[PDB]
Amino acid sequence: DLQKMVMANVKPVELILDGKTVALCCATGVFGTAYLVPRHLFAEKYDKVVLDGRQLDNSDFRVFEFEVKVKGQDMMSDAALMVLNRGQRVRDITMHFRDQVHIKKGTPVLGVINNADVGRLIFSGDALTYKDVVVAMDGDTMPGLFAYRAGTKVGYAGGAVMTKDGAHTVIIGTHSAGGNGVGYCSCVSRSSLLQLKAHID
């Protein structure tokens, strides 16, 4: 039910260069024209980018990078924010995130995915614990992640992951990376999301 309203915001993303599909992932709308996106992809180069079929050029959107406090230290989240100069409205789902969430073990976990490989998919998983920092093979550091047990191929990055606490269904952040039957999300705080909605509305 809520799960679907998250999907309404999730959109297939891709990165092209010289005509060939170089990369592919997801992005989740949070408000207005703001989309949560895997930062470690805008690092490596792109020519064109497709969001939901829209043939975007480089100069038509702008990216916001955030820092996170991991053990009282300041690192740059792998969850970035792609904002279109002009585009379509997504729902405000920023109201669903939180800030001081410590999720219990074994709890269910859902991963709303929408891309060009699989399509509009959801998956299930189990909550493990908080991981401080995770480093990729090329050095794409991913701080403040959250570990959950589930099957996650490539192109799931950017999808929206939601769990439970009490009677509430909280969105934690966006799926970042994984493999080995385990997955990782860039933990995103509501406070952070609101302080940017102020600056864009």
Author numbering: 7 to 207
Please quote the paper that reports this structure.
We report here the cloning and expression of 3Cpro from four distinct SAT1 and SAT2 viruses and the crystal structure of the 3Cpro from a SAT2 serotype virus (SAT2/GHA/8/91). Accordingly, for each SAT sub-type we generated expression constructs that add a thrombin-cleavable His tag to the N terminus of residues 1-208 of the 213 amino acid 3C protease; following thrombin cleavage there is a single additional Gly residue appended to the N terminus of the protease polypeptide. To ensure the solubility of the SAT-type 3C proteins, we introduced to all constructs a C142A substitution to remove a surface-exposed Cys that had been shown previously to be responsible for protein aggregation. In addition, the active site nucleophile was eliminated from all constructs by incorporation of a C163A substitution to prevent adventitious proteolysis in highly concentrated samples of purified 3Cpro. A complete dataset to 3.2 Å resolution was obtained from crystals of SAT2/G-g3Cpro(1-208). The crystals belong to space-group P32 and have a long c-axis (318.5 Å). This gave an unambiguous solution with a log likelihood gain of 1495, revealing five molecules in the asymmetric unit. Model building was done conservatively—amino acid side-chains were truncated to the Cβ atom in cases where there was no indicative electron density. The final model of SAT2/G-g3Cpro(1-208) contains residues 7–207 for all five chains and has an Rfree of 27.2% and good stereochemistry; full data collection and refinement statistics are given in Table 3. As expected, given the high level of amino acid sequence identity with A1061 3Cpro (80%), FMDV SAT2/G-g3Cpro(1-208) adopts the same trypsin-like fold, which has been described in detail elsewhere.
This yields a polyprotein precursor of over 2,000 amino acids that is processed into fourteen distinct capsid and non-structural proteins for virus replication. The majority of this processing is done by the virus-encoded 3C protease (3Cpro), which cleaves the precursor at ten distinct sites. FMDV 3Cpro may also assist infection by proteolysis of host cell proteins and has RNA-binding activity that is important for initiation of replication of the viral RNA.
